[PDB]
Paper text:
RTQ151M:DNA:[name] and RTQ151M:DNA:ETV-TP ternary complex crystals were prepared by soaking the crystals of the binary complex in the crystallization mother liquor supplemented with [name]/ETV-TP. The structures of the RTQ151M:DNA:[name] and RTQ151M:DNA:ETV-TP ternary complexes were determined at 2.38 Å and 2.45 Å resolution, respectively. The obvious electron density was observed for the bound [name]/ETV-TP and Mg2+. The structure of ETV-TP is identical to that of [name], except that ETV-TP has a cyclopentyl methylene instead of a ribose ring oxygen. In RTWT structures, a hydrogen bond is formed between the side-chain of Gln151 and Arg72, whereas the thioether group of Met151 in the RTQ151M structures occupies roughly the same position as Gln151 but keeps the distances of van der Waals contacts with nearby Arg72, Phe115, and C2′ of [name]/ETV-TP (3.6−4.0 Å). The structures reported in this work have been determined in the rhombohedral lattice system for the first time, whereas the structures of RTQ151M:DNA:[name]/ETV-TP basically exhibit a typical closed conformation of the [name]-1 RT ternary complex, and thus superimpose well on previously reported structures of the dNTP/NRTI ternary complex with main-chain RMSD of ~1.2 Å11,28,29. These results suggest that the lattice forces and the inter-molecular crystal contacts do not affect the overall structural conformation of [name]-1 RT ternary complex.
Numbering used by the authors:
A (entry chain B): 4 to 213, 231 to 427
B (entry chain A): 3 to 553
Write the structure that this text describes.
């Protein structure tokens, strides 16, 4: 019973037309019951084929919450939706979130279900539920309400959200709340138990109007490391010189001329070469330059974030987050702790969720990922391990390791 | 039908079609005043006049009844000007996805599209003219009041209407399975034949209230049921007979037909191959170009015929048992698989033979086949099967540990059905003691098309070979080729080609490139090979000597 906000697509752009991919039995059943209940509650409406738009839909199951959660992949629609920094409905990101001792993520998408959506935009939110063995044609719905996962929902619901959080943030000035899409990131410096307690109080406040724990203090940066030996082969110095030569694109004043001078002549790779005093000097200097962070690299909120990932083996994955090439805002190393140790695709999916989560906490948005995986391998399995209510942009790359920079 | 119409529009700025009819014979146009009069009596069409400026040509083919005719309209222009639709038909049901049912019925709706009304405001665009007397008089013209056959919006609107009409019966009878494909209804149940026929009569009455007739001619009551190109028996299902073309002289189009038929047959006939027959289609220029069968294509065809003359059947799905998919390697990037639950009782079969990428290996292609089978299994049965694969656990472990991209295969067990899938070589992680060290390099001139490839070695050996009509990357691969050619069983190799290192380090066993194929040959024949990279033009070790030598 509220007046809707007029929203439109970006000029010269049409709505999303993305095909539905196959779904397992359990996901289809979950989506059927969820969409049935949403249909009875008026949140969605059944539509026909004269609506030419579509967006893929699937379902996830958080490990700590055994109830299914519907997830619509509105990435295309969000890319085609108007920006809201012109309607002044954007969300400022607080710099204090990444300093907090603990940060709990909360799914507050259900709030969006209390605000109607512009009548002339609803057709862009259509989605189709598939059928096992194609027993029936797909079942099409569209939203009558601010949808979960749509970028316009946090912008339109902003005023409401601030009005609902005002008392809690008033009673707790040193707890930080940052809304990203359907999520609230809640950071505090106090001890674990009372932190979870205040999270419970926050919950009951939200529940009354209408538990994923992170530790940013534990996020370290993994720099470029040089090996340390007593005797060095020709091969060791070739790989060292190549590594440092690549590193001269990122850092400043890195020399190779003396270490490289050691290699004069056509020498056997296994032949041991003694290190010149001047060459040892060069190795110590370059080793020190890599120890301290690079000078002159700053975040630019007008540009997108990009994340690269490399598989290192034995459950280790290195990553870099940058905006311009070789000017890394962050370098890191993800490692799984599940014990099973035998699924590359699961580990990479979890790594993407963790990296994107850190990007939300630090900068307020997710980066576009360059994934070291075949497109079809990723698309065959990634939904089986996804746990976030948001989905980042990604592309697929095949670049073997020339040198092993990050390990 | 009293069903509510579906609003449809033309694309923005577009108008209706204004084309002309063909050929205007008194046999033809008297047949055209013959066919329509009954449709007008039933209300499917209405006469219109010159104040309607649109037109579209009409024709007719013969139905598989072989006595009844099917009226079609060439709506290509109108279709181009009609709004887009989102198609609700996402795939094709498969008999291997059916469960055993006590009682089965197959029904078809009579004149299905003509039972669904068309949007009033849109009807003016479906106008078709039939000349009165060979253009000697204004002319008789009609417009459609129902869904036309040939309009791109008709199938989706009919499917949606049928879904809405069936929904009440579905919700009221959850224990009755209704496969709905266009106007073809499969209806299975675990009821006794009496109450089953009661529910069938109720369903037909429900359809008739909404204007969907179910003629007895298309009402199947006893097995074998003809359904979606298959024959359904109580315990098994078969494909309807597949007749391969038999020609003395083969054209491109004949071979295309043959390959298509063999692909259709591969869903239940195990071991079908089409690689050699499909190779005949490559490089051809016309559909009527005569193509002589190679020896390999004749052998492959004969093997397929031997397979096809043996009777086969699939069985139905038991959800209380596991799905099992077993894969075999057939050679030259060809793979065949069977999906079953009890041994020697296939639910279905299939094959995978796509060449993805310029350079690949058997492990990658086996992974691709696994992914195809997984997707197909999710479509048909809603779950992923357990795999039996001809690859050792050690081979897979080695591959996914050494390879740099993330890869995975779900729960699988090793099955010993040679030829097994294996890695054909492995590059050493450390340099080899006592092995010769080759510093290789190749370079080409892009304007000139000339290049050179050579090496310098730590034992004093050097070589330079000229190359014509080449590229940069080709000269680098050529340098590696030379090093592998002139070295012993064990060799260390140093290059500056990130490209060549990238290809070789992925351990390919096949390639669309002759040069890469030769390199693969040489690598398979070696005993130990260590391959290393250095940056170019930095005056490094032997790399500077060989780079100086090539120039
Ligand atoms: N444009 C077009 N539509 C077709 C064609 N074949 C089938 N359809 C569509 C239109 C049909 O109404 C619908 C059902 O196929 P049917 O073979 O059952 O034809 P229909 O029901 O109209 O006549 P019937 O009483 O079953 O003999 O599917 C075709 O060849 N061209
Ligand atoms: O995995 C990429 C794959 O996803 C699709 C839809 O399934 O596109 C989605 O992902 C893209 C990559 O980020 C987005 O650009 C796009 O907006 C989103 O819908 C396919 O297009 C693509 O093949
Ligand atoms: Mg029919």
């Amino acid at each position: 019973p509220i007046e809707t906000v007029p929203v439109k697509l970006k000029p010269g752009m049409d709505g999303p037309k993305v095909k539905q991919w196959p779904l397992t039995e359990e996901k289809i059943k979950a989506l059927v019951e969820i969409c049935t209940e949403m249909e009875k509650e008026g949140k969605i409406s059944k539509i026909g084929p004269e609506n030419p738009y579509n967006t893929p839909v699937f379902a996830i199951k958080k490990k700590d919450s055994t109830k299914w959660r519907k997830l619509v992949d509105f990435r295309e629609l969000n890319k085609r939706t108007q920006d809201f920094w012109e309607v002044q409905l954007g969300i400022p990101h607080p710099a204090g979130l990444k300093q907090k001792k603990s940060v709990t993520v909360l799914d507050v998408g259900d709030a969006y279900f209390s605000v109607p959506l512009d009548k002339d935009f609803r057709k862009y939110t259509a989605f189709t539920i598939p059928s096992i063995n194609n027993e029936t044609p797909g079942i099409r719905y569209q939203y009558n309400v601010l949808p979960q996962g749509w970028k316009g929902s946090p912008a339109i619901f902003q005023s409401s959200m601030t009005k609902i959080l005002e008392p809690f943030r008033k009673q707790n000035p040193d707890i930080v709340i940052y809304q990203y899409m359907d999520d609230l990131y809640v950071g505090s410096d106090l001890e674990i138990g009372q932190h979870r307690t205040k999270i419970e109080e926050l919950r009951q406040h939200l529940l009354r109007w209408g538990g994923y724990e992170l530790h940013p203090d534990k996020w370290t940066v993994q720099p470029i490391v040089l090996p340390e030996k007593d005797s060095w082969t020709v091969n060791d110095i070739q790989k060292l010189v190549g590594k440092l030569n690549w590193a001269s694109q990122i850092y400043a004043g890195i020399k190779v001329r003396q270490l490289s001078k050691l290699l004069r002549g056509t020498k056997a790779l296994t032949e041991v070469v003694p290190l010149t005093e001047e060459a040892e000097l060069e190795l110590a200097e370059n080793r020190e330059i890599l120890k301290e962070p690079v000078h002159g690299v700053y975040y630019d909120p007008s540009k997108d974030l990009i994340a690269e990932i490399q598989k290192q083996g034995q459950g280790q994955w290195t990553y870099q987050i940058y905006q311009e090439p070789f000017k890394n805002l962050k370098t890191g190393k993800y490692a799984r702790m599940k014990g099973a140790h035998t699924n590359d695709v699961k580990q990479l999916t979890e790594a993407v969720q963790k990296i994107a989560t850190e990007s939300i906490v630090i900068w307020g948005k997710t980066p576009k990922f360059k994934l070291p995986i075949q497109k079809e391998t990723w698309e065959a399995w990634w939904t089986e391990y996804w746990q976030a209510t948001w989905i980042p942009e990604w592309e697929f790359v095949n670049t073997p390791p020339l040198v092993k920079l990050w390990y | 039908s009293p069903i509510e119409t579906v609003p449809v529009k033309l694309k923005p700025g577009m108008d209706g079609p204004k084309v002309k009819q063909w050929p205007l014979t008194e046999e033809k146009i008297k047949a055209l005043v013959e066919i329509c009069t009954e449709m007008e009596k039933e209300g499917k069409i209405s006469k219109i006049g010159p104040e309607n400026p649109y037109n579209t040509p009409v024709f007719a083919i013969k139905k598989k009844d072989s006595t009844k005719w099917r009226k079609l309209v060439d709506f290509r222009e109108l279709n181009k000007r009609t709004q887009d639709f989102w198609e609700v038909q996402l795939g094709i049901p498969h008999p291997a996805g059916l469960k055993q049912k006590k009682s089965v019925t197959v029904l078809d709706v009579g004149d299905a599209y003509f039972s669904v009304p068309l949007d009033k405001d849109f009807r003016k665009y479906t106008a078709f003219t039939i000349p009165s007397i060979n253009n000697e008089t204004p002319g008789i013209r009609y417009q459609y009041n129902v869904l036309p056959m040939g309009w791109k919006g008709s199938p989706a609107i009919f499917q949606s209407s049928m879904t809405k009409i069936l929904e009440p019966f579905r919700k009221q009878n959850p224990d009755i399975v209704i496969y709905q494909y266009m106007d073809d209804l499969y209806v299975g149940s675990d009821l006794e034949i009496g109450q089953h026929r009661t529910k069938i009569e109720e369903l037909r009455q429900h359809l008739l209230r909404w204007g969907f007739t179910t003629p007895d001619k298309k009402h199947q009551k006893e097995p074998p049921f003809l359904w979606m190109g298959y024959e359904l028996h109580p315990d098994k299902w078969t494909v309807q007979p597949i007749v391969l073309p038999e020609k003395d002289s083969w054209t491109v189009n004949d071979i295309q037909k043959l390959v298509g038929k063999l692909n259709w047959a591969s869903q239940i006939y195990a071991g079908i191959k089409v690689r050699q027959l499909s190779k005949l289609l490559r490089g051809t220029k016309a559909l009527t170009e005569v193509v002589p069968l190679t020896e390999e294509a004749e052998l492959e065809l004969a093997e397929n015929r031997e397979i096809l003359k043996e009777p086969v059947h699939g069985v139905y799905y038991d959800p209380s048992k596991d799905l099992i998919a077993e894969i075999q390697k057939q050679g030259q990037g060809q793979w065949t698989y069977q999906i079953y639950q009890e041994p020697f009782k296939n639910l279905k079969t299939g094959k995978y033979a796509r060449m993805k990428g310029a350079h690949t290996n058997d492990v990658k292609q086996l992974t691709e086949a696994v992914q195809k089978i997984a997707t197909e299994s999710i479509v048909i049965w809603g779950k992923t099967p357990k795999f039996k694969l001809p690859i050792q656990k050690e081979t897979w472990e080695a591959w996914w540990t050494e390879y740099w991209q993330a890869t995975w295969i779900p729960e699988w067990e090793f099955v010993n059905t040679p030829p097994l899938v294996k890695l054909w070589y492995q590059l050493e992680k450390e340099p080899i003691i006592g092995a010769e060290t080759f510093y290789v390099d190749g370079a080409a001139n892009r304007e000139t098309k000339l290049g050179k490839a050579g090496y310098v070695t730590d034992r004093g050996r050097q070589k330079v070979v000229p190359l014509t009509d080449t590229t940069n990357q080709k000269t680098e691969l050529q340098a590696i080729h030379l090093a592998l050619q002139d070295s012993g069983l064990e060799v260390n190799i140093v290059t500056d080609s990130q490209y060549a290192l990238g290809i070789i380090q992925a351990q390919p066993d096949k390639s669309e490139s002759e040069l890469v194929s030769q390199i693969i040959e040489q690598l398979i024949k070696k005993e130990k090979v260590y391959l290393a990279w250095v940056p170019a033009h930095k005056g490094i070790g032997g790399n500077e000597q060989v780079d100086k030598l090539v120039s």
